[PDB]
PDB file of C-alpha atoms in Angstrom:
ATOM      1  CA  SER A   2      59.056  38.805 151.670  1.00  0.00           C
ATOM      2  CA  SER A   3      62.486  40.627 151.562  1.00  0.00           C
ATOM      3  CA  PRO A   4      65.508  38.696 150.985  1.00  0.00           C
ATOM      4  CA  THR A   5      66.759  40.059 154.599  1.00  0.00           C
ATOM      5  CA  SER A   6      63.610  38.533 156.041  1.00  0.00           C
ATOM      6  CA  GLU A   7      63.681  35.445 153.872  1.00  0.00           C
ATOM      7  CA  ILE A   8      67.254  34.614 154.831  1.00  0.00           C
ATOM      8  CA  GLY A   9      66.647  35.423 158.525  1.00  0.00           C
ATOM      9  CA  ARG A  10      63.812  33.109 158.567  1.00  0.00           C
ATOM     10  CA  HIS A  11      65.796  30.441 156.729  1.00  0.00           C
ATOM     11  CA  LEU A  12      68.447  30.731 159.290  1.00  0.00           C
ATOM     12  CA  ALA A  13      66.092  30.279 162.151  1.00  0.00           C
ATOM     13  CA  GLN A  14      64.888  26.981 160.676  1.00  0.00           C
ATOM     14  CA  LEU A  15      68.492  25.702 160.081  1.00  0.00           C
ATOM     15  CA  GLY A  16      69.242  26.360 163.748  1.00  0.00           C
ATOM     16  CA  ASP A  17      66.150  24.746 164.923  1.00  0.00           C
ATOM     17  CA  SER A  18      66.748  21.713 162.610  1.00  0.00           C
ATOM     18  CA  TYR A  19      70.353  21.664 163.610  1.00  0.00           C
ATOM     19  CA  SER A  20      69.166  21.422 167.491  1.00  0.00           C
ATOM     20  CA  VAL A  21      67.188  18.099 166.984  1.00  0.00           C
ATOM     21  CA  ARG A  22      69.936  15.902 166.900  1.00  0.00           C
ATOM     22  CA  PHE A  23      71.416  16.961 170.296  1.00  0.00           C
ATOM     23  CA  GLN A  24      68.125  16.293 172.171  1.00  0.00           C
ATOM     24  CA  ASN A  25      67.732  13.022 170.362  1.00  0.00           C
TER      25      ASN A  25
ATOM     26  CA  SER B   5      84.432  42.421 179.964  1.00  0.00           C
ATOM     27  CA  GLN B   6      81.509  40.731 178.259  1.00  0.00           C
ATOM     28  CA  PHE B   7      81.577  42.581 175.032  1.00  0.00           C
ATOM     29  CA  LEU B   8      85.244  41.699 174.714  1.00  0.00           C
ATOM     30  CA  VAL B   9      84.739  37.872 175.535  1.00  0.00           C
ATOM     31  CA  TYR B  10      82.248  37.746 172.613  1.00  0.00           C
ATOM     32  CA  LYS B  11      84.529  39.583 170.217  1.00  0.00           C
ATOM     33  CA  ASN B  12      87.385  37.212 171.028  1.00  0.00           C
ATOM     34  CA  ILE B  13      84.917  34.122 170.403  1.00  0.00           C
ATOM     35  CA  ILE B  14      83.909  35.467 166.844  1.00  0.00           C
ATOM     36  CA  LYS B  15      87.337  36.543 165.957  1.00  0.00           C
ATOM     37  CA  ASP B  16      88.563  33.129 166.788  1.00  0.00           C
ATOM     38  CA  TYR B  17      85.811  31.391 164.954  1.00  0.00           C
ATOM     39  CA  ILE B  18      86.134  33.817 161.768  1.00  0.00           C
ATOM     40  CA  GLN B  19      89.924  33.489 161.750  1.00  0.00           C
ATOM     41  CA  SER B  20      89.873  29.834 161.795  1.00  0.00           C
ATOM     42  CA  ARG B  21      87.222  29.672 159.107  1.00  0.00           C
ATOM     43  CA  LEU B  22      89.101  32.203 156.962  1.00  0.00           C
ATOM     44  CA  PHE B  23      92.191  30.124 157.321  1.00  0.00           C
ATOM     45  CA  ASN B  24      90.630  26.978 156.301  1.00  0.00           C
ATOM     46  CA  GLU B  25      89.058  28.798 153.354  1.00  0.00           C
ATOM     47  CA  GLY B  26      92.533  29.995 152.003  1.00  0.00           C
ATOM     48  CA  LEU B  27      91.766  33.631 152.749  1.00  0.00           C
ATOM     49  CA  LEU B  28      93.552  34.323 155.986  1.00  0.00           C
ATOM     50  CA  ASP B  29      96.301  36.812 155.638  1.00  0.00           C
ATOM     51  CA  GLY B  30      98.920  35.081 157.732  1.00  0.00           C
ATOM     52  CA  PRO B  31      98.693  32.299 160.073  1.00  0.00           C
ATOM     53  CA  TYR B  32      95.815  31.180 162.161  1.00  0.00           C
ATOM     54  CA  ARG B  33      96.846  31.146 166.013  1.00  0.00           C
ATOM     55  CA  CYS B  34      94.331  31.184 168.755  1.00  0.00           C
ATOM     56  CA  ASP B  35      94.806  34.125 171.243  1.00  0.00           C
ATOM     57  CA  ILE B  36      92.394  33.053 174.010  1.00  0.00           C
ATOM     58  CA  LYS B  37      94.106  32.479 177.280  1.00  0.00           C
ATOM     59  CA  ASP B  38      90.997  31.634 179.495  1.00  0.00           C
ATOM     60  CA  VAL B  39      90.999  27.928 179.310  1.00  0.00           C
ATOM     61  CA  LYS B  40      86.966  28.032 179.411  1.00  0.00           C
ATOM     62  CA  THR B  41      86.842  30.515 176.809  1.00  0.00           C
ATOM     63  CA  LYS B  42      89.039  28.227 174.639  1.00  0.00           C
ATOM     64  CA  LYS B  43      86.903  25.347 175.155  1.00  0.00           C
ATOM     65  CA  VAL B  44      83.831  27.263 174.234  1.00  0.00           C
ATOM     66  CA  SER B  45      85.510  28.538 171.075  1.00  0.00           C
ATOM     67  CA  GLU B  46      86.677  25.099 170.012  1.00  0.00           C
ATOM     68  CA  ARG B  47      83.301  23.686 170.417  1.00  0.00           C
ATOM     69  CA  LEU B  48      81.659  26.581 168.682  1.00  0.00           C
ATOM     70  CA  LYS B  49      83.867  25.842 165.655  1.00  0.00           C
ATOM     71  CA  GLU B  50      83.025  22.038 165.707  1.00  0.00           C
ATOM     72  CA  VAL B  51      79.111  22.733 165.867  1.00  0.00           C
ATOM     73  CA  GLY B  52      79.407  25.755 163.268  1.00  0.00           C
ATOM     74  CA  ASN B  53      81.293  23.640 160.900  1.00  0.00           C
ATOM     75  CA  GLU B  54      78.928  20.898 161.290  1.00  0.00           C
ATOM     76  CA  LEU B  55      75.853  23.052 160.851  1.00  0.00           C
ATOM     77  CA  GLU B  56      77.463  24.852 157.749  1.00  0.00           C
ATOM     78  CA  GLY B  57      78.332  21.485 156.324  1.00  0.00           C
ATOM     79  CA  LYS B  58      74.682  20.282 156.800  1.00  0.00           C
ATOM     80  CA  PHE B  59      73.380  23.362 154.839  1.00  0.00           C
ATOM     81  CA  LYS B  60      76.480  24.103 152.752  1.00  0.00           C
ATOM     82  CA  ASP B  61      74.616  25.214 149.525  1.00  0.00           C
ATOM     83  CA  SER B  62      72.330  27.534 151.501  1.00  0.00           C
ATOM     84  CA  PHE B  63      75.175  29.232 153.432  1.00  0.00           C
ATOM     85  CA  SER B  64      77.495  29.390 150.357  1.00  0.00           C
ATOM     86  CA  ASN B  65      75.099  31.595 148.292  1.00  0.00           C
ATOM     87  CA  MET B  66      73.389  33.468 151.211  1.00  0.00           C
ATOM     88  CA  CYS B  67      75.333  36.625 150.952  1.00  0.00           C
ATOM     89  CA  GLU B  68      75.043  36.853 147.227  1.00  0.00           C
ATOM     90  CA  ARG B  69      71.333  36.950 147.652  1.00  0.00           C
ATOM     91  CA  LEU B  70      71.636  39.943 149.829  1.00  0.00           C
ATOM     92  CA  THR B  71      73.335  42.357 147.409  1.00  0.00           C
ATOM     93  CA  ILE B  72      75.831  43.472 149.911  1.00  0.00           C
ATOM     94  CA  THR B  73      77.643  46.840 149.421  1.00  0.00           C
ATOM     95  CA  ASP B  74      79.616  49.032 151.740  1.00  0.00           C
ATOM     96  CA  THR B  75      76.713  51.014 152.723  1.00  0.00           C
ATOM     97  CA  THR B  76      74.138  48.160 152.992  1.00  0.00           C
ATOM     98  CA  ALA B  77      76.549  45.697 154.926  1.00  0.00           C
ATOM     99  CA  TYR B  78      75.560  46.554 158.530  1.00  0.00           C
ATOM    100  CA  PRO B  79      71.866  47.347 158.015  1.00  0.00           C
ATOM    101  CA  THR B  80      71.514  43.900 156.168  1.00  0.00           C
ATOM    102  CA  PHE B  81      73.468  42.148 158.973  1.00  0.00           C
ATOM    103  CA  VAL B  82      71.120  43.704 161.663  1.00  0.00           C
ATOM    104  CA  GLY B  83      67.958  43.076 159.401  1.00  0.00           C
ATOM    105  CA  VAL B  84      68.868  39.407 158.856  1.00  0.00           C
ATOM    106  CA  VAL B  85      69.885  38.713 162.540  1.00  0.00           C
ATOM    107  CA  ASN B  86      66.843  40.560 163.906  1.00  0.00           C
ATOM    108  CA  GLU B  87      64.472  38.477 161.752  1.00  0.00           C
ATOM    109  CA  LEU B  88      66.356  35.349 162.954  1.00  0.00           C
ATOM    110  CA  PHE B  89      65.877  35.870 166.526  1.00  0.00           C
ATOM    111  CA  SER B  90      62.356  37.586 166.214  1.00  0.00           C
ATOM    112  CA  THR B  91      60.584  34.258 166.507  1.00  0.00           C
ATOM    113  CA  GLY B  92      62.763  33.121 169.362  1.00  0.00           C
ATOM    114  CA  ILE B  93      66.469  32.340 170.589  1.00  0.00           C
ATOM    115  CA  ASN B  94      68.038  29.186 171.099  1.00  0.00           C
ATOM    116  CA  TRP B  95      71.463  27.708 170.847  1.00  0.00           C
ATOM    117  CA  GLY B  96      70.877  26.205 167.335  1.00  0.00           C
ATOM    118  CA  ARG B  97      69.944  29.658 166.136  1.00  0.00           C
ATOM    119  CA  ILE B  98      72.938  31.165 167.842  1.00  0.00           C
ATOM    120  CA  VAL B  99      75.236  28.774 166.036  1.00  0.00           C
ATOM    121  CA  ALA B 100      73.499  29.735 162.654  1.00  0.00           C
ATOM    122  CA  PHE B 101      73.975  33.462 163.577  1.00  0.00           C
ATOM    123  CA  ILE B 102      77.502  32.769 164.079  1.00  0.00           C
ATOM    124  CA  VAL B 103      77.850  30.738 160.841  1.00  0.00           C
ATOM    125  CA  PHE B 104      76.105  33.417 158.877  1.00  0.00           C
ATOM    126  CA  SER B 105      78.617  35.975 160.402  1.00  0.00           C
ATOM    127  CA  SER B 106      81.391  33.819 159.114  1.00  0.00           C
ATOM    128  CA  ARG B 107      80.071  33.789 155.549  1.00  0.00           C
ATOM    129  CA  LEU B 108      79.625  37.428 155.658  1.00  0.00           C
ATOM    130  CA  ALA B 109      83.215  37.629 156.465  1.00  0.00           C
ATOM    131  CA  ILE B 110      84.059  35.334 153.746  1.00  0.00           C
ATOM    132  CA  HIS B 111      82.117  37.213 151.280  1.00  0.00           C
ATOM    133  CA  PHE B 112      83.933  40.501 152.328  1.00  0.00           C
ATOM    134  CA  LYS B 113      87.297  38.922 151.911  1.00  0.00           C
ATOM    135  CA  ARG B 114      86.563  37.406 148.524  1.00  0.00           C
ATOM    136  CA  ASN B 115      84.320  40.232 146.937  1.00  0.00           C
ATOM    137  CA  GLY B 116      86.513  43.499 147.323  1.00  0.00           C
ATOM    138  CA  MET B 117      85.559  44.495 151.109  1.00  0.00           C
ATOM    139  CA  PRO B 118      88.333  42.868 152.924  1.00  0.00           C
ATOM    140  CA  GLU B 119      88.454  45.770 155.525  1.00  0.00           C
ATOM    141  CA  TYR B 120      84.851  44.798 156.699  1.00  0.00           C
ATOM    142  CA  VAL B 121      86.130  41.676 158.120  1.00  0.00           C
ATOM    143  CA  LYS B 122      87.318  43.220 161.275  1.00  0.00           C
ATOM    144  CA  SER B 123      83.827  45.128 161.343  1.00  0.00           C
ATOM    145  CA  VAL B 124      81.902  41.792 161.644  1.00  0.00           C
ATOM    146  CA  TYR B 125      83.686  40.973 164.728  1.00  0.00           C
ATOM    147  CA  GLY B 126      82.409  44.213 166.519  1.00  0.00           C
ATOM    148  CA  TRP B 127      78.975  43.750 164.848  1.00  0.00           C
ATOM    149  CA  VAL B 128      78.701  40.414 166.340  1.00  0.00           C
ATOM    150  CA  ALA B 129      79.919  41.223 169.837  1.00  0.00           C
ATOM    151  CA  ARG B 130      77.617  44.113 170.039  1.00  0.00           C
ATOM    152  CA  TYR B 131      74.555  42.112 168.854  1.00  0.00           C
ATOM    153  CA  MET B 132      75.452  39.348 171.511  1.00  0.00           C
ATOM    154  CA  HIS B 133      76.059  42.059 174.086  1.00  0.00           C
ATOM    155  CA  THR B 134      72.968  44.158 173.641  1.00  0.00           C
ATOM    156  CA  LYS B 135      70.338  41.514 172.276  1.00  0.00           C
ATOM    157  CA  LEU B 136      71.408  38.070 173.259  1.00  0.00           C
ATOM    158  CA  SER B 137      73.203  38.665 176.634  1.00  0.00           C
ATOM    159  CA  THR B 138      69.940  38.394 178.848  1.00  0.00           C
ATOM    160  CA  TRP B 139      69.021  35.309 177.113  1.00  0.00           C
ATOM    161  CA  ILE B 140      72.441  33.706 177.444  1.00  0.00           C
ATOM    162  CA  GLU B 141      72.977  34.320 180.896  1.00  0.00           C
ATOM    163  CA  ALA B 142      69.228  33.241 181.785  1.00  0.00           C
ATOM    164  CA  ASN B 143      70.157  29.904 179.827  1.00  0.00           C
ATOM    165  CA  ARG B 144      73.444  29.256 181.866  1.00  0.00           C
ATOM    166  CA  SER B 145      75.812  31.048 179.638  1.00  0.00           C
ATOM    167  CA  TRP B 146      78.294  29.014 178.106  1.00  0.00           C
ATOM    168  CA  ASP B 147      77.908  25.935 180.371  1.00  0.00           C
ATOM    169  CA  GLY B 148      74.340  25.822 179.004  1.00  0.00           C
ATOM    170  CA  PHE B 149      75.725  25.885 175.509  1.00  0.00           C
ATOM    171  CA  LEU B 150      78.215  23.155 176.019  1.00  0.00           C
ATOM    172  CA  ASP B 151      75.568  21.204 177.722  1.00  0.00           C
ATOM    173  CA  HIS B 152      73.072  21.572 174.752  1.00  0.00           C
ATOM    174  CA  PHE B 153      75.815  20.267 172.328  1.00  0.00           C
ATOM    175  CA  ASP B 154      77.046  17.286 174.439  1.00  0.00           C
TER     176      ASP B 154
END
């Protein structure tokens, strides 16, 4: 719920999303 | 010499990013002599730039959302990065970690905390050395990174 936890969770999804291309 | 390898990689990444942003005091020059570390750094700059561009707006305002001050800067760094890796480590997330760290450095240069830019290098190197080193070596280190993004 914290902005710290919000931003960390967001970064995790950004990194996951970014990785998809490179196994496609 | 592992902490120093990480420090030189993030230093190169951030110096290049600050240069491109018009924030670097003086010229950008790469000081990495190890051919392989230089190749790693060049690829990391390429994929970090691509990740940042894909999510430009999110990365642009990220540090403003965190209400950073001199006293909360490191605890916020640790808190954000711990949360990021709490549900797993992978190379995409490591790149996002690097991009976030570069945005922190930009924030510091622009918002009157320029002395903290050099602190980012040590914070990232220490984080990689303590919390990501086992994972990195278990995933074939930088050769695994380069393979992943081929």
